[PDB]
């Protein structure tokens, strides 16, 4: 059986760690909810 536990409030934090890129990707979404790269 699955259960839930609280982990925190939903708030924006000023001065949080800024990381990660912004790629533009061509993708396809199948009937099973799975994304794939189109090339």
């Amino acid at each position: 059986d699955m259960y839930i536990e609280r982990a925190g409030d939903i708030t924006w934090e000023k001065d949080a760690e800024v990381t990660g890129n912004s790629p533009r990707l061509d993708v396809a979404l199948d009937e099973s909810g799975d994304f794939s790269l189109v090339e």
């Binding site: 949080a16 760690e17 800024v18 890129n21 979404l29």
Partner: protein
């Protein structure tokens, strides 16, 4: 049981010890998560029981106790924060500028951050703290890194 608004861990006791399979958002008395996390199964909150209300495998989303309540959208320009809730680790805000997933049905935002599979369902927020989507369904690119869609449902 616990109906307070906020971010929650989705746990199971079926495997070894206690395992975190995903994360969700409680908002307006409704628990929102990714379909692949629970597979539509019922959830427990202390003594309380949460039953599935709406779900769709293609959108990879599921709501408990009521219809999908989250409707805010990424503006296409601004930086966002992934409120990452990793297994056995504290909730942490990570700010990033989203990329794009171009599909035959239109563009979706994409957050390029790598977290274990048990982080699926962590909310993505705008500068006002509104949930613009959930992290945890995406693709693995050339260098073996993960890029998640900014998956958002439709409010009725």
């Amino acid at each position: 049981g616990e109906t307070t608004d906020g971010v929650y861990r989705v746990m199971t006791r079926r495997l070894l010890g206690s395992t975190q399979v995903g994360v969700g958002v409680m908002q307006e008395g409704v628990f929102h998560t990714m379909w692949h996390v629970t597979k539509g199964a019922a959830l427990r909150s202390g003594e309380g029981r949460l039953d599935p209300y709406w779900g769709d495998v293609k959108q990879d989303l599921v709501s408990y106790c009521g219809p999908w309540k989250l409707d805010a959208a990424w503006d296409g320009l601004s930086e966002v924060q992934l409120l990452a809730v990793p297994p056995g680790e504290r909730a942490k805000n990570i700010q990033t500028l989203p990329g794009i997933f171009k599909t035959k049905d239109g563009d979706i935002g994409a957050v390029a951050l790598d977290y274990p599979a048990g982080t699926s369902g962590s909310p993505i927020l705008d500068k006002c703290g509104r949930v613009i989507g959930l992290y945890g369904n995406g693709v693995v690119i050339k260098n073996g890194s993960y890029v998640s869609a900014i998956t958002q449902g439709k409010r009725e």
